[PDB]
Amino acid sequence: MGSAGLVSLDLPLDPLWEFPRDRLVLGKPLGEGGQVVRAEAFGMDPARPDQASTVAVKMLKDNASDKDLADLVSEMEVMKLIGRHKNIINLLGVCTQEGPLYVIVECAAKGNLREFLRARRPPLSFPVLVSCAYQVARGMQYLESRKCIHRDLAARNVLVTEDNVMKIADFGLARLPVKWMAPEALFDRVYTHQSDVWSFGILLWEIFTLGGSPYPGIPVEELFSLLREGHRMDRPPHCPPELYGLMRECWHAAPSQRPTFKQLVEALDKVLLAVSEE
Ligand SMILES: Cc1ccc(C(=O)Nc2ccc(CN3CCN(C)CC3)c(C(F)(F)F)c2)cc1C#Cc1cnc2cccnn12
């Protein structure tokens, strides 16, 4: 029971990824933009065929165009090439043949990182916050090694499992993320790994403000003019200068002066180690 666009595209059966439609029972909605719904999957680990699993399933709406289908097909194929990693949301399967296009991934029980942090504000220990930042750094390092540029790294686009494992995702634009973007991305529309490093800096600031909104008070129209005078966000409350140093390094105007994701993984591991020692 597929749409007119999907029948026209006539996608092939990928034997590594095609999962049976009848072994998937849809449940509660998780997110909207397409839409994400929670589902029960049976035999998603094919060695254990009768074993039940909770998954997340992305799909188009009834009022979706052919361009929206092409984007979801484009999203499907990008996720195949990236590969399995601890800190990327794992593709589990797809449904393409006998109905609407479904893109299946693992369900992160605690939701997105922004709502995770905001929900646990005081009326989250320091090692947990450093672990979050470190894990996102490791995910982005993996992305870069796969020659993959995210373009919209933010707390909303990181998912959190039951065990507080960070899973990098992309849900598209929210219902333009100006406050997360490097100058070259905002102004010249040039996206690189180093432009993702800028956004990681803004994500770090989100984590240690417990899901705070960046540049509070300053409207988006006045932001870019303020950036090229050299102004940046101040050190947030209860944040050491070592972590603030990494943020300011991420916000260097020149991309080459910003740290690499390899360097960010190394620096954050030292902070994780320092907070665990005693
Ligand atoms: C069903 C579903 C389908 C797809 C994706 C998804 O994020 N796909 C994705 C597409 C592209 C990219 C990388 N590109 C970015 C653009 N860029 C230009 C090129 C590189 C990546 C990334 F992880 F690599 F970033 C992921 C997530 C879900 C989810 C879910 C889920 C699970 N639990 C919960 C709980 C609450 C809400 N949602 N949810």
How would you summarize the topology of this molecule?
Blueprint: H1 4-9, E1 24-32, E2 35-42, E3 52-59, H2 66-82, E4 91-95, E5 102-106, H3 113-119, H4 126-145, E6 158-160, E7 166-168, H5 183-188, H6 193-208, H7 220-227, H8 241-250, H9 261-277
Antiparallel strand pairs: 1-2, 2-3, 3-5, 4-5, 6-7
Helix pairs in contact: 4-6, 4-9, 6-8
The structure holds ligand 0LI.
Description:
By secondary structure, this protein is of the alpha+beta class. The protein folds into 2 domains: 11-107, Phosphorylase Kinase, domain 1; 108-270, Transferase(Phosphotransferase) domain 1 (Transferase(Phosphotransferase), domain 1, Orthogonal Bundle), CATH 1.10.510.10. It is 38% helix and 15% strand. A 5-stranded antiparallel beta sheet has the order 1-2-3-5-4. A two-stranded antiparallel sheet has the order 6-7. Helix 4 packs antiparallel against helix 6, helix 4 (126-145) packs antiparallel against helix 9 and helix 6 packs antiparallel against helix 8 (241-250). Ligand 0LI is lined by residues 30-31, 36, 56-58, 75, 78-79, 82, 88-89, 103, 105, 107-108, 111, 143, 148-151, 159, 168-170.
